[PDB]
Every structure is written in C-alpha cells, then in structure tokens.
Amino acid sequence: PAPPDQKPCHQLQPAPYRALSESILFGSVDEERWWHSTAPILSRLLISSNYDVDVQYKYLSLYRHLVLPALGPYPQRDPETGIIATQWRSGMVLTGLPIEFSNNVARALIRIGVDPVTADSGTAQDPFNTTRPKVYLETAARLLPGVDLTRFYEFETELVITKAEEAVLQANPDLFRSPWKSQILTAMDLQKSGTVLVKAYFYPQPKSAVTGRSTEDLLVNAIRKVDREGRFETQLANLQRYIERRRRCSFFPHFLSTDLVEPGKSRVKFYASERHVNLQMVEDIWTFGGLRRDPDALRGLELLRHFWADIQMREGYYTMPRGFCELGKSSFEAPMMFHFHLDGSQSPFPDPQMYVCVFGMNSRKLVEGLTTFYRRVGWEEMASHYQANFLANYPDEDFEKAAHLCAYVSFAYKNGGAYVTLYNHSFNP
Amino acid sequence: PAPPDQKPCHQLQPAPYRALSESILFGSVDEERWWHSTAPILSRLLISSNYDVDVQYKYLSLYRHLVLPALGPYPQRDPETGIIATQWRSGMVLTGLPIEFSNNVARALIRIGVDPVTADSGTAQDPFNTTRPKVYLETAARLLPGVDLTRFYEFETELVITKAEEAVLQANPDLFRSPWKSQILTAMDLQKSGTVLVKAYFYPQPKSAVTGRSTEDLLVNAIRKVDREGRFETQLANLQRYIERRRRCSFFPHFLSTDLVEPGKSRVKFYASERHVNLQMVEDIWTFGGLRRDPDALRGLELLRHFWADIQMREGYYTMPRGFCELGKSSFEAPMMFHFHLDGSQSPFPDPQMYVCVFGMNSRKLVEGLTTFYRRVGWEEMASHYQANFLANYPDEDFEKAAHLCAYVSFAYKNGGAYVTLYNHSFNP
Numbered sequence: 097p098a099p100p101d102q103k104p105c106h107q108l109q110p111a112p113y114r115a116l117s118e119s120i121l122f123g124s125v126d127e128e129r130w131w132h133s134t135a136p137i138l139s140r141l142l143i144s145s146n147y148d149v150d151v152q153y154k155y156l157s158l159y160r161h162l163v164l165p166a167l168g169p170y171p172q173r174d175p176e177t178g179i180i181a182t183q184w185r186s187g188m189v190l191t192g193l194p195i196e197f198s199n200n201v202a203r204a205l206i207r208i209g210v211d212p213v214t215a216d217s218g219t220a221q222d223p224f225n226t227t228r229p230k231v232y233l234e235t236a237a238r239l240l241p242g243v244d245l246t247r248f249y250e251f252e253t254e255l256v257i258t259k260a261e262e263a264v265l266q267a268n269p270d271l272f273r274s275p276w277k278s279q280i281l282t283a284m285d286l287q288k289s290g291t292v293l294v295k296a297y298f299y300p301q302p303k304s305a306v307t308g309r310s311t312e313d314l315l316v317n318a319i320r321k322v323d324r325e326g327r328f329e330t331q332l333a334n335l336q337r338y339i340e341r342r343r344r345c346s347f348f349p350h351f352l353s354t355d356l357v358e359p360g361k362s363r364v365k366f367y368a369s370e371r372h373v374n375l376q377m378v379e380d381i382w383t384f385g386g387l388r389r390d391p392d393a394l395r396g397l398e399l400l401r402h403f404w405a406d407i408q409m410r411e412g413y414y415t416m417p418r419g420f421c422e423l424g425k426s427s428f429e430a431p432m433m434f435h436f437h438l439d440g441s442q443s444p445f446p447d448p449q450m451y452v453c454v455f456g457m458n459s460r461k462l463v464e465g466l467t468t469f470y471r472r473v474g475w476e477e478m479a480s481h482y483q484a485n486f487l488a489n490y491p492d493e494d495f496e497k498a499a500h501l502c503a504y505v506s507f508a509y510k511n512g513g514a515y516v517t518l519y520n521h522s523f524n525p
Numbered sequence: 526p527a528p529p530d531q532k533p534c535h536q537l538q539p540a541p542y543r544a545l546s547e548s549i550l551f552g553s554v555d556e557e558r559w560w561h562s563t564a565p566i567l568s569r570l571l572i573s574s575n576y577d578v579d580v581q582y583k584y585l586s587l588y589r590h591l592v593l594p595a596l597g598p599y600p601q602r603d604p605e606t607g608i609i610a611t612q613w614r615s616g617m618v619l620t621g622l623p624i625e626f627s628n629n630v631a632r633a634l635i636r637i638g639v640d641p642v643t644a645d646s647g648t649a650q651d652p653f654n655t656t657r658p659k660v661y662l663e664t665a666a667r668l669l670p671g672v673d674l675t676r677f678y679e680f681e682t683e684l685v686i687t688k689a690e691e692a693v694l695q696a697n698p699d700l701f702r703s704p705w706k707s708q709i710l711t712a713m714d715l716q717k718s719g720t721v722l723v724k725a726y727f728y729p730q731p732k733s734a735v736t737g738r739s740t741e742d743l744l745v746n747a748i749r750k751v752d753r754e755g756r757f758e759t760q761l762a763n764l765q766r767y768i769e770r771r772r773r774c775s776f777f778p779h780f781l782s783t784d785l786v787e788p789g790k791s792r793v794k795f796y797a798s799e800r801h802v803n804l805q806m807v808e809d810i811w812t813f814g815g816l817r818r819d820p821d822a823l824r825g826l827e828l829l830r831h832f833w834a835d836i837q838m839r840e841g842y843y844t845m846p847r848g849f850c851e852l853g854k855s856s857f858e859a860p861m862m863f864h865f866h867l868d869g870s871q872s873p874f875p876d877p878q879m880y881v882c883v884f885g886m887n888s889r890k891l892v893e894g895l896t897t898f899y900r901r902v903g904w905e906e907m908a909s910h911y912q913a914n915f916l917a918n919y920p921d922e923d924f925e926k927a928a929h930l931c932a933y934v935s936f937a938y939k940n941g942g943a944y945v946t947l948y949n950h951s952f953n954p
C-alpha cells in the first residue's frame with residue numbers, strides 16, 4: 097500500500113471556508129454557529145489530505161446543506177461551571193457532540209460522523225431520537241448516488257424500538273438508566289473521486305431493555321435474518337464460538353454497522369467492547385484464541401504490538417463510564433473495542449479491527465507517539481506534517497492539559513499494511 | 526487600459542457547477558429548476574473571464590443562496606404556442622425573465638442583473654412588485670460588506686409608489702397601461718477580488734402616472750434632493766439644458782441608477798432613451814449638441830463610429846415596443862439608450878455611455894461583428910475566444926434564426942479605451 101498524502105495547512109480561515117462563509121445565507125442561528133465552529137476544521141482536513149479543490153467545495157457545500165440542519169441546537173455554555181454541551185448527549189463522542197470528523201491517516205481519507213438530532217431529541221417528545229436519523233439517511237439517499245437503504249430498513253425494523261416500545265420506556269424510566277441513548281448513528285466516507293459512501297450504525301440496547309433479549313441475540317438474529325444468501329454464515333458462527341469461548345466475561349457484544357449499497361454485495365461489521373485492555377487480551381481477540389494464526393494475521397499482530405508501544409497505551413481493567421465528559425470538565429478511562437468485518441469472502445474468520453479509547457490521555461503526547469509509528473511504517477509526509485496539522489485545529493487551547501482532542505484510535509492490517517484512523521474533537525467555540 | 530482576459534470554456538457542465546449541483550439540497554422546485562437552467566451559463570462566464578477558483582465558488586454559492594429564491598416561479602411553457610414565460614414580465618429583459626448575466630468584455634467582468642419577484646408579483650396582491658426588491662437589497666446588505674443602502678432608501682421614498690398610490694392604480698387600471706411594471710431593478714458587479722458591488726435602478730413611470738409629475742421632473746428632483754453636498758449640480762444642470770434643447774422630441778428621460786456605497790462618495794447615472802437611432806443623433810447626444818468636444822470626447826466618438834459600423838447597426842426611428850417578445854415567438858426594433866454618469870468630478874458634462882438594442886438582430890452575426898471590433902482595438906484573447914464561448918452557452922439552438930441571445934450592447938470611452946458590455950440571454954430550458 098502506497099504512503100498517504102499529507103500537506104501542511106495551519107490557516108485559521110482556509111480559503112474554501114471563507115469563500116462559502118461570505119456567500120451563505122443561513123435560515124437558522126444554530127446552523128450558522130455550527131458552521132463557524134466546525135467548517136474551518138473540515139476545510140483544513142480536506143486540504144491537508146490533498147483532496148482536489150472541486151471536491152473540497154462539493155463536500156463543504158454538502159456539509160452546509162445536509163449536515164448542519166441535522167446537528168440541531170448549537171451547544172450552550174454554563175456560566176458558572178463553563179461546561180459546553182448540547183441537551184442531547186450523543187453516543188458517538190464522549191463529549192456528547194453530534195458531529196465528529198475522523199481521519200484515516202493510512203489513506204489520507206476524511207469521514208463525517210453525524211448523530212442527526214432536533215430540538216426535541218432527548219426531551220419527553222423524542223427521548224430516544226428515533227425519527228431524525230432515518231430522515232437524514234433518506235435525505236442523503238435521494239441526494240447522493242449509489243446509496244441503497246435496503247440494509248438500513250431491515251436492521252432498523254429489527255434493532256430500533258417501535259412507537260409502542262418507546263411508550264413503555266417513557267412510562268417506566270427505570271427500565272433504561274443508561275445515558276447512551278443513541279440507537280442510530282451515521283457516517284459519510286469522503287472518497288477522493290467525489291463519491292460519498294454512507295454507513296449506518298445500530299445500537300440495540302434500548303430494544304434489548306424492552307423486548308428482554310440480549311444485545312448478542314439481537315445483533316446475530318438481525319444479521320442472520322437479513323443475510324438471505326448466507327454469505328456471512330461461516331464467519332458469524334466462528335465469531336459466536338469465540339464469544340461462547342469467552343463466556344465460559346469482559347467481552348461484550350455492543351453494536352453493528354452496515355454500508356448502504358447493493359444488498360447482495362454489502363458488508364456488515366460486528367462490534368464488541370473489551371474491558372481487559374492489555375496486549376495479552378488483544379492477541380486472544382486478534383487470533384480468536386489462537387485459531388487464526390495465518391501469516392497475514394501474525395504480521396498484523398506484530399505491527400499492532402509496535403503501534404501499542406509507540407502510543408504508550410496504559411493497560412488496565414476499564415468499565416463503561418458513569419457519564420459523559422463534556423467540553424469544560426476534567427478528563428478518564430473506558431473499555432477498548434473491536435469490530436469484526438463480515439466480508440462474505442472465502443475466509444473462516446472475519447477481519448478484526450481494534451479501537452482503543454485514548455480519551456483521557458494527553459492528546460499532544462498521543463500524536464507525538466503516533467508520529468513515531470508513522471516513521472516506523474515509512475509514511476514520510478504524514479510523519480513530517482500530521483502533528484502540526486492536528487494541533488492547528490485547536491488554536492486557543494492548552495495542549496499541556498488537553499486530553500479530549502482524540503477520543504479513539506483504530507488499528508487494522510489491510511493489504512499487507514497498517515490501517516490507522518483517528519477519531520478527533522471537531523468543535524471550536 | 527490592458528486587454529481583457531478570455532479563456533475558452535465550452536463544457537456543457539463546468540466542474541464548479543457539477544460540484545455544487547451534487548451537494549445542494551433545494552427547498553423549492555423552482556429554485557432547483559432555475560439553478561439548472563442558469564448556473565451552467567454563470568459558471569462558464571466566470572471561467573472564461575478568468576476569475577480565481579475560490580471566487581468562482583463564492584459567486585456560484587452566492588447565486589444559490591441569494592438569487593435563486595428572488596427569481597420566484599420557474600417559467601412555464603404553453604403546450605400549443607411553445608412560448609416559455611413567467612407570470613411577471615420583468616422590465617429588465619425583453620424576454621421578460623427576472624435574470625440576466627451581462628459580460629463586460631472590455632474588462633472581462635461579469636454582472637448579475639436580477640428582478641426580485643415572488644409568486645404574487647404581477648397578480649392583484651402585488652401588481653407592481655413593490656416589496657420584494659427591497660427585501661432582496663436588505664438581505665444582500667447584511668450578507669455583503671460595504672453595501673450602504675442610504676442612497677436606495679432616499680430614491681425609493683421619492684420614485685416608488687406608496688400603498689395608497691398603489692390602491693389608485695389597482696382601482697383604476699386604465700391610468701397605467703404599460704406592460705413594463707418593474708419599478709426597482711438590481712445588479713451585482715462581480716469583482717475579481719471577491720467583493721460584490723451592488724446597484725439599484727429606479728423606473729418611476731408608475732409614480733409619474735399617479736402623482737401627475739413627468740419622469741424628468743421626478744428623476745431630477747430626486748437627484749437634487751438627495752445631493753446634499755451639491756456635487757452633481759453642474760453636470761445635472763447642463764444635462765437639463767441639453768434635454769431642454771432637444772425639447773425645443775425623441776429624447777425621453779427614462780430612469781436612473783445608483784451604487785450602494787458611502788453616500789458622499791457615491792455616483793448616480795441618469796438614463797434616457799432615444800427613438801432616432803442613427804450616428805448623427807449619437808454625435809449630438811455624445812457631444813451635447815457640439816458643446817462637449819474635448820480630445821477625449823472626440824476620440825471616443827471616432828471609436829464609437831467604428832463600433833457602430835462593425836456590428837452593422839441598422840439605423841431607423843423606433844418607438845417603445847407594443848409588448849414583450851418572450852422565449853418562443855419570432856424576433857424586432859426598439860429605441861437606443863444613453864446613461865449620463867453624474868460622477869461628481871470637475872467636468873462640466875456627465876460622462877455619456879451608449880446602449881443599442883440589438884434584440885431582433887441575428888445574435889451570431891452580431892458577435893461576429895463584435896469580433897471585428899475586438900481585433901480593431903487589439904483585444905487578442907477576446908477576439909480569438911469570445912465567439913465560441915458566447916455560442917457555447919446555448920447548445921440546443923438554431924443560430925441561423927436566433928436573434929434574442931443578445932438584447933443590448935453598451936459602448937463607452939473610459940481611460941483612453943473602449944468599454945463594451947453585452948447583455949445576454951441567461952436561460953436554457
């Protein structure tokens with residue numbers, strides 16, 4: 097795999113952000129304030145990732161038209177405590193913001209994570225945010241080519257609560273006490289060509305609470321019922337057997353995601369979170385208890401050990417946090433995560449990808465450690481320029497204390513090479 | 526004056542038009558259809574005029590946000606006659622469309638002429654379109670820097686009908702039988718820097734009908750009352766004396782326009798239309814009956830005679846047309862026009878600029894004649910490329926018969942050089 101592009105871009109107001117800012121009439125104060133707090137970051141990310149200028153303008157305009165109205169009310173600041181937060185605490189980011197730009201620094205690709213909300217999201221009128229994410233994906237579908245919602249509707253029927261089930265949770269609040277109430281999250285992959293690849297994520301914990309069925313059973317039955325051809329069957333069964341092995345438990349099945357394209361050629365990812373955050377546990381998961389030890393699998397594990405050591409990952413046993421850590425309060429530990437890529441290929445085991453929660457760790461120190469890894473795998477442009485670009489996104493900030501600028505970092509081994517993505521703070525007040 | 530830039534651009538779908546088209550969510554079918562019928566033309570014009578890419582995107586986005594909603598209902602086509610037209614017949618273009626892109630081919634600058642309308646414009650609810658142009662200019666004012674509405678409000682008070690005066694015209698339709706009902710028109714000059722220069726035009730013929738005051742008296746008293754400092758006094762008086770001379774009549778005072786900037790440093794243009802369209806009449810107007818014959822004035826007149834002969838202007842006596850010539854019916858004669866630039870300078874006479882109505886003349890033949898003039902004044906890039914660019918704006922068209930693609934051509938002598946602007950059809954069904 098060729099090394100990723102990385103151009104420096106530290107401008108407070110990138111040219112494309114200015115050109116659009118001077119031309120847009122907003123019909124909402126919220127949209128206008130969201131734009132100015134997040135558009136500069138997105139514009140820098142696209143310039144540093146070396147997207148074409150035409151494509152930069154397409155995606156910033158798309159951000160303006162499609163995303164801004166889906167962000168709902170602009171976050172409000174507490175005069176006393178100084179905590180900046182929205183009413184709806186999104187399960188997409190530990191800050192609780194409905195927007196996140198992630199950076200695939202292996203390919204120099206940018207993705208827009210969005211949790212579509214309204215003014216009523218979280219209140220008594222819409223306590224689990226059931227409708228708006230669907231409307232968002234329907235709007236995206238009509239606008240963007242190749243977006244097939246077939247997979248979304250099938251998983252939505254099976255993993256999202258109905259009107260009747262919602263009334264039960266409203267009438268009996270004690271049945272679901274978790275602050276993480278997002279059922280559906282979204283992501284748009286921004287390709288270099290101009291094509292946008294849309295993904296949906298389903299968190300069935302509310303459905304699990306009402307129906308009395310575990311998260312594992314909800315996800316597996318969902319995947320199995322949707323998989324008419326039986327393409328995911330072998331890999332799903334061996335994942336179940338690994339989950340069965342770990343049960344006989346810190347390995348928790350959590351959620352899934354699906355690409356929105358041709359159903360017979362679409363792929364599902366199964367996510368689980370692990371509490372024991374150490375390299376011994378990682379090998380066990382990465383190799384399925386030693387069953388998956390082919391050359392590609394082992395070479396990936398060896399590079400994972402370097403990645404782990406370079407970023408100075410602190411090992412420990414971490415549970416799911418008590419609550420959110422909003423922008424303003426002190427930063428923190430949480431469980432690591434793994435997705436398993438049900439790719440429908442010939443392989444017996446689904447492709448694993450590790451996510452480590454770095455929220456709580458010094459962000460400047462993490463990126464310096466990441467630079468060490470960039471030099472290890474020979475990503476010259478990225479090693480030289482990424483750090484200065486990451487920090488440039490947060491001008492008025494103390495990097496000596498800031499531990500919220502990167503929440504998660506992901507690691508996978510694809511096509512004989514490291515695949516790394518940073519999930520970063522995407523908001524400047 | 527340096528020669529104008531002109532790059533070739535014949536693409537059916539220019540890149541910036543595509544990038545935005547693939548990213549915009551329209552809240553109106555009308556806006557969406559206007560965009561696709563006019564945005565390709567604007568994008569080509571900006572590329573051929575050699576605007577920077579950042580500035581292209583600013584102005585296309587500005588077009589989308591500010592202009593599209595001001596165009597009102599998309600034009601409808603008669604199934605039998607094939608005539609495509611809007612309910613409101615705008616006095617800005619002989620086709621009756623509320624949008625026109627003009628090309629200052631002397632400087633390679635593009636201007637957006639707009640007649641802001643709504644669904645109610647022309648009907649019994651708003652028969653003279655009084656409110657929407659004001660709202661448009663107020664919206665533009667807040668969005669765009671340097672836009673001072675002081676001149677607009679003063680001329681609006683004096684030249685636009687009040688609510689009471691409107692009721693009189695509604696109650697008695699025979700008091701104003703003219704199809705040209707636009708009182709306020711607008712224009713945005715697109716500078717190369719990114720700055721937009723906004724202008725307002727006031728046609729006081731409805732005010733003249735109700736108040737019983739002539740168009741001449743309405744305009745002059747307006748200019749004189751607004752001109753507190755007395756900067757326009759000398760030039761206005763000598764224009765009045767020329768109008769007085771011509772009265773003792775085919776020279777008709779018609780309307781005025783004003784830039785929207787610092788009031789004490791803003792400039793007014795006085796427009797009059799002439800029925801006798803011949804070179805002998807042009808010299809008389811251009812020289813104020815022989816009073817203005819300084820070297821700059823005479824050199825300009827000599828070049829005007831070449832311009833006149835190159836485009837093959839047919840001489841004659843032409844009155845104001847009986848009605849509009851909408852897109853679909855056969856093309857035609859009409860009076861020529863002159864603006865007089867009350868510049869507030871030391872000069873005794875205001876700077877004249879000629880407008881010739883070329884609507885009715887073969888547009889391909891006119892542009893070929895214009896190319897001859899471009900070669901005469903040494904505009905090499907413009908001579909080589911303009912014709913192919915003009916025609917590229919109308920793909921599915923018979924140029925053998927088409928006489929509506931250019932409505933007016935303007936001529937002035939500025940800074941020892943020819944100043945030419947084409948006012949062109951800006952719509953593709």
Ligand SMILES: O=C1N[C@@H](Cc2c[nH]c3ccccc23)C(=O)N2CCC[C@@H]12
Nearest residue numbers: 187188189190209281282283297504519
């Ligand atoms: O903040 C969270 N993020 C997601 C994953 C994610 C990160 N970036 C995303 C972008 C799109 C979809 C999902 C994600 C999640 O599952 N979490 C469980 C614990 C904390 C919480």
Ligand SMILES: O=C1N[C@@H](Cc2c[nH]c3ccccc23)C(=O)N2CCC[C@@H]12
Nearest residue numbers: 616617618619638710711712726933948
């Ligand atoms: O079609 C017309 N155009 C304007 C001038 C104009 C041309 N392009 C413009 C752009 C902005 C403002 C004014 C204009 C006008 O005064 N006319 C009188 C006779 C026909 C009618």
Ligand SMILES: CC(C)=CCSP(=O)(O)OP(=O)(O)O
Nearest residue numbers: 198207283295433451504519
């Ligand atoms: C950060 C978390 C938990 C999930 C995001 S998965 P993603 O869609 O960003 O990763 P891919 O593009 O599928 O490799």
Ligand SMILES: CC(C)=CCSP(=O)(O)OP(=O)(O)O
Nearest residue numbers: 627636712724862880933948
């Ligand atoms: C075509 C007619 C009658 C008027 C337009 S005047 P304009 O504002 O386009 O010309 P300038 O930019 O003032 O020289």
Ligand SMILES: [Cl-]
Nearest residue numbers: 257258259260
């Ligand atoms: Cl339902």
Ligand SMILES: [Cl-]
Nearest residue numbers: 456457458461
């Ligand atoms: Cl640390």
Ligand SMILES: [Cl-]
Nearest residue numbers: 686687688689
């Ligand atoms: Cl009034």
Ligand SMILES: [Cl-]
Nearest residue numbers: 885886887890
């Ligand atoms: Cl002819």
